[PDB]
Amino acid sequence: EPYIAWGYPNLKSVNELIYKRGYGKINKKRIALTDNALIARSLGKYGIICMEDLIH
Amino acid sequence: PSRLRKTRKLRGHVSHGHGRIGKHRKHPGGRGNAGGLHHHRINFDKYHPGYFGKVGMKHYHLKRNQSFCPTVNLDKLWTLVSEQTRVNAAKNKTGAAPIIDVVRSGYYKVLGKGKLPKQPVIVKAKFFSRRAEEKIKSVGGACVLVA
Amino acid sequence: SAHLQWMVVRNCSSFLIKRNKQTYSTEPNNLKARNSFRYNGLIHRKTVGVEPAADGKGVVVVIKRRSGQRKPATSYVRTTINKNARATLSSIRHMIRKNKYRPDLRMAAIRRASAILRSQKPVMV
Amino acid sequence: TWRRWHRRVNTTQKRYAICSALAASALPALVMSKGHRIEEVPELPLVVEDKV
Amino acid sequence: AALRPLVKPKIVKKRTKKFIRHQSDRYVKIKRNWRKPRGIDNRVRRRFKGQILMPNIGYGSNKKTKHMLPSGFRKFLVHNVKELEVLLMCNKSYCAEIAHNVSSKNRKAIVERAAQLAIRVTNPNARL
Amino acid sequence: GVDIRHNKDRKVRRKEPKSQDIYLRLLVKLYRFLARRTNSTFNQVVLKRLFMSRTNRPPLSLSRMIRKMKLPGRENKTAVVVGTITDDVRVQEVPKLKVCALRVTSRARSRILRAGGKILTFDQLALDSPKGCGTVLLSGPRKGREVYRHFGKAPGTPHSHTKPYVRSKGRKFERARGRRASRGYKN
Amino acid sequence: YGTWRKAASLKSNYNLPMHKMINTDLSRILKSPEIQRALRAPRKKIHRRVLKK
RNA sequence: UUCAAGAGGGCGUGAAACCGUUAAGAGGUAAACGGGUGGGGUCCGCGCAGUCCGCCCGGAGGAUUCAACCCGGCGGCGGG
RNA sequence: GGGGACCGUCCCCCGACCGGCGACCGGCCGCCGCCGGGCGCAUUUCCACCGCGGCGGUGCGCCGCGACCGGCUCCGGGACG
RNA sequence: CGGCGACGUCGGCUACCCACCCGACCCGUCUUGAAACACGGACCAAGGAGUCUAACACGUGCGCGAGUCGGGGGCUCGCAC
RNA sequence: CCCCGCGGACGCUACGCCGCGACGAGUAGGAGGGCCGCUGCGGUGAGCCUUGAAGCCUAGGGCGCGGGCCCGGGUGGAGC
Ligand SMILES: [K+]
Ligand SMILES: [K+]
Ligand SMILES: [K+]
Ligand SMILES: [K+]
Ligand SMILES: [K+]
Ligand SMILES: [K+]
Ligand SMILES: [K+]
Ligand SMILES: [K+]
Ligand SMILES: [K+]
Ligand SMILES: [Mg+2]
Ligand SMILES: [Mg+2]
Ligand SMILES: [Mg+2]
Ligand SMILES: [Mg+2]
Ligand SMILES: [Mg+2]
Ligand SMILES: [Mg+2]
Ligand SMILES: [Mg+2]
Ligand SMILES: [Mg+2]
Ligand SMILES: [Mg+2]
Ligand SMILES: [Mg+2]
Ligand SMILES: [Mg+2]
Ligand SMILES: [Mg+2]
Ligand SMILES: [Mg+2]
Ligand SMILES: [Mg+2]
Ligand SMILES: [Mg+2]
Ligand SMILES: [Mg+2]
Ligand SMILES: [Mg+2]
Ligand SMILES: [Mg+2]
Ligand SMILES: [Mg+2]
Ligand SMILES: [Mg+2]
Structure with a gap:
């Protein structure tokens, strides 16, 4: 509690966090989410294939 | 080569790797095996059990030659003769068995570790173990003693 | 073998020069004169070298023949080209490319021939 | 004086150094890389008649 | 005028x-040559503000321009004409310079040969 | 600042042979290419064994190789060991064997060849099976060394059967107090 | 020094050391059709960091 | 005199500490130091009308010979 | 004690088949390439000069200015729900 | 896209002197703690301190491998090496 | 079935070169690298040198994070 500040993000907060600062852990590397193929390669088996799916 | 050693890397470092607090001093703890029952007791007990005390009977003027009795196991027995000897015996039609003189090869006692190939052989030795004799007779061989 | 002989002389050779964070090799048939397996002029079954002519004009294209690899006296065939620069480069291009004689050295030999010819023309005032 | 100046090398080591040295002496690239000017030598495993 | 390098970043x-x-x-007895301070109380070693800075790998030069002379060339020391022809194919990236011990008569031939091969000499007029 | 520990960042593993053997370096080059440009995990294991030290490449006796080759379903397979193959004079019958080894003892080599066997080096194995198909990758006993008798718990501790370091073996050398109940204790 | 099929007749116990690599022609081995058939295609495109717009 | 006494009988070279003189600069917080600039000065830059070179176009001149064929020589590759 | 026989490795040969001419070499052919000499003697080829020529590359002796594009950032207007 | 270029200027963040702003206590050492009213240090030069032998242990490299090792001795023109 | 063009950059010291991501305090202490440095030996540089070696001096030009190094000028006089 003394070390964190937290709350309940709204839809706009999720969008701007993912789009501006969204980085994926791909092969243990911090890779910027510049293409949808980066999301689909690692998360397509779960049905997530784009930034919109990740945000949803 | 002195160029490959830690001394070349410890130049400019004041304590030469021995440390500022403890320093490097002549003989802290004693010289040699000092205090093996006192301040070095744990090391001696941990790594050298049995070090302190007498066990057994002493024997003055031990002569190692009198007890000289090298041993050979049955698995190595056929290596004392030539490869010609063992193929000839195997393909021999008769019951002729080659003679292996382990005393000639430098062994006095025949021990019985391993197994023998299924072919008879006459083994000459000063001493035989009980199991070595049993295995030699199992393959149809014989054990004969020499002095 | 070239790879085996390379492992012997890659760092231990009389032609090796290691100065100023750079490395150079001075064997006779080394285009670019660099210490490398590709450009070494001694370890390969076929090599090509470009040298200035004995006089002050033209180039000498030396190739290594395939037969006497252990016979250095007759192992190299030297030809002299003493024509215009464009025709000289064409001859070297045809010797390397048309014969398929070490095509990986084509531009290195052509560039070296240009440097030699450029050095042979008189300086200006 | 008792610095242990000498070293013993196994005989099989030493024979195997000789074999490597002899095999290297028949390859032009290695002999040239020692700088021996074997430019016009007829043949590097170079053998002459017993008359010499 | 002078021979220009291939690129001048x-x-x-x-x-x-x-x-x-x-x-x-x-102290005169202590020369300017860098030595890492190892004293227990040394404030330079402890990196106190306003003190003498300590060299570290962060000051390393860009690998693209390391050992590059202000003229955009890199130098190769040469002792005779034969060592000068190793730079024939490195004309536009490496410049020759003549070693200090080379005689006046011999470095005249080196300068003359380097002018022919378009190799730049950092000290072309060095004994004359 | 970030909250991590840096004491395990550098993994300690052989990335190349510490040997300067130019022939070993050549076939390291060959198998560095094969491991990279193929999906065969056999090439990866062989490549990393080539880096290994001699103690990590124990010799493989002829008896052990024969015994592993005699297991069901391994007929007409190549025995691959990254190390030395050693003659075992305790065996009398050598079957036909297809063998790839870094090094073969002269007596072992003569026995294998006389029995109609075939011996390959690792350059020939690459041409024969580039992916290592139809091979049995064997290893000598890694702990078949005298040092491992001394490793483990300390000898002067209960339920430890580790060999102590003694200059001599005899009734006078470390057989008294701490070794028998009559002499203080035994544990 | 002997052959690989004769022991030396003037050293009574010596034989030529054995090769651990018969064919030390790396270029020829790698270009052999047996090796080339087993390989995957080379990945020669360089992927440089993408500036996150 | 000597090549040289800027080699002159404890004389090859001739450092530092320290000192004299000359030149420049500065000076009430002991000097000295790190970072950042500014001023001055000694030098460096063949600085001082500032690159080179590939192709093509145009102009004005030379030289063979350009290609293709013939002869000879030498190489590379292939051949039941 | 010799001398023999046998066995294991050898040896140089008399010969055939087998895989290939190989990184062990030659002769013949075939293709290609280079060089030398002829011929080809000019809408070809090559050499040097000039243009304050064009296209490319590198880079401007020094001191400066502008423009648009992209990245990061701090701000300001306007409008909608 | 502009300006300026030889006896006066152009560039040289390095290097010499000076000025200003900010920062800055003297090192070494023992120590929980040194700028210390804790010790050593006036200055400069040259010298100056983990070495060698033996014995173990483990790791690594090399050769051979159920073996391995000639180190003592002997044989080789007795010796430039 | 390339051919009006017969042509098409660089590379790969594989102990090399290239890409991506994260990370960077340190006494005692440990390890790695050192194209850091000194002296001598085996090789090698058809190395350097009285047309000037070593050493020393230097408001001279530079290189390296650094240990240090190269070059100019002077002195010096036989080696490096
Ligand atoms: K220590
Ligand atoms: K640090
Ligand atoms: K671990
Ligand atoms: K004098
Ligand atoms: K004091
Ligand atoms: K001996
Ligand atoms: K030398
Ligand atoms: K440096
Ligand atoms: K001097
Ligand atoms: Mg320390
Ligand atoms: Mg000190
Ligand atoms: Mg101390
Ligand atoms: Mg000082
Ligand atoms: Mg402290
Ligand atoms: Mg950080
Ligand atoms: Mg840490
Ligand atoms: Mg004088
Ligand atoms: Mg004097
Ligand atoms: Mg003065
Ligand atoms: Mg103290
Ligand atoms: Mg106290
Ligand atoms: Mg203090
Ligand atoms: Mg106080
Ligand atoms: Mg005291
Ligand atoms: Mg004092
Ligand atoms: Mg005092
Ligand atoms: Mg000193
Ligand atoms: Mg750190
Ligand atoms: Mg610097």
Whole structure:
């Protein structure tokens, strides 16, 4: 509690966090989410294939 | 080569790797095996059990030659003769068995570790173990003693 | 073998020069004169070298023949080209490319021939 | 004086150094890389008649 | 006029001044050559503000412009004409310079040959 | 600042042979290419064994190789060991063997060849099976060394059967107090 | 020094050392059709960091 | 005199500490130091009308010979 | 004690088949390439000069200015729900 | 896209002197703690301190491998090496 | 079935070169690298040198994070 500040993000907060600062852990590397193929390669088996799916 | 050693890397470092607090001093703890029952007791007990005390009977003027009795196991027995000897015996039609003189090869006692190939052989030795004799007779061989 | 002989002389050779964070090799048939397996002029079954002519004009294209690899006296065939620069480069291009004689050295030999010819023309005032 | 100046090398080591040295002496690239000017030598495993 | 290098990138030097040894200003017996301070209370080793800076790998030059002379060339020391022809195919990236011990008569031939091969000499007029 | 520990960042592993053997370096080059440009995990294991030290490449006796080759379903397979193959004079019958080894003892080599066997080096194995198909990758006993008798718990501790370091073996050398109940204790 | 099929007749116990690599022609081995058939296609495109717009 | 006494009988070279003189600069917080600039000065830059070179176009001149064929020589590759 | 026989490795040969001419070499052919000499003697080829020529590359002796594009950032207007 | 270029200027963040702003206590050492009213240090030069032998242990490299090792001795023109 | 063009950059010291991501305090202490440095030996540089070696001096030009190094000028006089 003394070390964190937290709350309940709204839809706009999720969008701007993912789009501006969204980085994926791909092969243990911090890779910027510049293409949808980066999301689909690692998360397509779960049905997530784009930034919109990740945000949803 | 002195160029490959830690001394070349410890130049400019004041304590030469021995440390500022403890320093490097002549003989802290004693010289040699000092205090093996006192301040070095744990090391001696941990790594050298049995070090302190007498066990057994002493024997003055031990002569190692009198007890000289090298041993050979049955698995190595056929290596004392030539490869010609063992193929000839195997393909021999008769019951002729080659003679292996382990005393000639430098062994006095025949021990019985391993197994023998299924072919008879006459083994000459000063001493035989009980199991070595049993295995030699199992393959149809014989054990004969020499002095 | 070239790879085996390379492992012997890659760092231990009389032609090796290691100065100023750079490395150079001075064997006779080394285009670019660099210490490398590709450009070494001694370890390969076929090599090509470009040298200035004995006089002050033209180039000498030396190739290594395939037969006497252990016979250095007759192992190299030297030809002299003493024509215009464009025709000289064409001859070297045809010797390397048309014969398929070490095509990986084509531009290195052509560039070296240009440097030699450029050095042979008189300086200006 | 008792610095242990000498070293013993196994005989099989030493024979195997000789074999490597002899095999290297028949390859032009290695002999040239020692700088021996074997430019016009007829043949590097170079053998002459017993008359010499 | 002078032979130009193949490319002339902007050379960026992180530090332009020498790392002088601690207290080399106070003693003649201590030379400016850098030595890492290892004293228990040394404030330079502890990196107190306003003190003599310590060299570290962060000051390293860009690998693209390392060992590059202000003229955009890199130098190869040469001792005779034969060593000069190793730079024939490195004309536009490496410049020759003649070793200090080479005689006046012999370095005349080196300068003459280097002018022919379009190799740049950093000290072309050095004994005359 | 970030909250991590840097004491395990550098993994300690052989990335190349510490040997300067130019022939070993050549076939390291060959198998560095094969491991990279194929999906065969056999090439990866062989490549990393080539880096290994001699103690990590124990010799493989002829008896052990024969015994592993005699297991069901391994007929007409190549025995691959990254190390030395050693003659075992305790065996009398050598079957036909297809063998790839870094090094073969002269007596072992003569026995294998006389029995109609075939011996390959690792350059020939690459041409024969580039992916290592139809091979049995064997290893000598890694702990078949005298040092491992001394490793483990300390000898002067209960339920430890580790060999102590003694200059001599005899009734006078470390057989008294701490070794028998009559002499203080035994544990 | 002997052959690989004769022991030396003037050293009574010596034989030529054995090769651990019969064919030390790396270029020829790698270009052999047996090796080339087993390989995957080379990945020669360089992927440089993408500036996150 | 000597090549040289800027080699002159404890004389090859001739450092540092320290000192004299000359030149420049500065000076009430002991000097000295790190970072950042500014001023001055000694030098460096063949600085001082500032690159080179590939192709093509145009102009004005020379030289063979350009290609293709013939002869000879030498190489590379292939051949039941 | 010799001398023999046998066995294991050898040896140089008399010969055939087998895989290939190989990184062990030659002769013949075939293709290609280079060089030398002829011929080809000019809408070809090559050499040097000039243009304040064009296209490319590198880079401007020094000191400066502008423009648009992209990245990061701090701000300001306007409008909608 | 502009300006300026030889006896006066152009560039040289390095290097010499000076000025200003900010920062800055003297090192070494023992110590929980040194700028210390804790010790050593006036200055400069040259010298100056983990070495060698033996014995173990483990790791690594090399050769051979159920073996391995000639180190003592002997044989080789007795010796430039 | 390339051919009006017969042509098409660089590379790969594989102990090399290239890409991506994260990370960077440190006494005692440990390890790695050192194209850091000194002296001598085996090789090698058809190395350097009285047309000037070593050493020393230097408001001279530079290189390296650094240990240090190269070059100019002077002095010096036989080696490096
Ligand atoms: K220590
Ligand atoms: K650090
Ligand atoms: K671990
Ligand atoms: K004098
Ligand atoms: K004091
Ligand atoms: K001996
Ligand atoms: K030398
Ligand atoms: K440096
Ligand atoms: K001098
Ligand atoms: Mg320390
Ligand atoms: Mg000290
Ligand atoms: Mg101390
Ligand atoms: Mg610097
Ligand atoms: Mg000082
Ligand atoms: Mg402290
Ligand atoms: Mg950090
Ligand atoms: Mg840490
Ligand atoms: Mg004088
Ligand atoms: Mg004097
Ligand atoms: Mg004065
Ligand atoms: Mg103290
Ligand atoms: Mg106290
Ligand atoms: Mg203190
Ligand atoms: Mg106080
Ligand atoms: Mg005291
Ligand atoms: Mg004193
Ligand atoms: Mg005092
Ligand atoms: Mg000293
Ligand atoms: Mg750190």
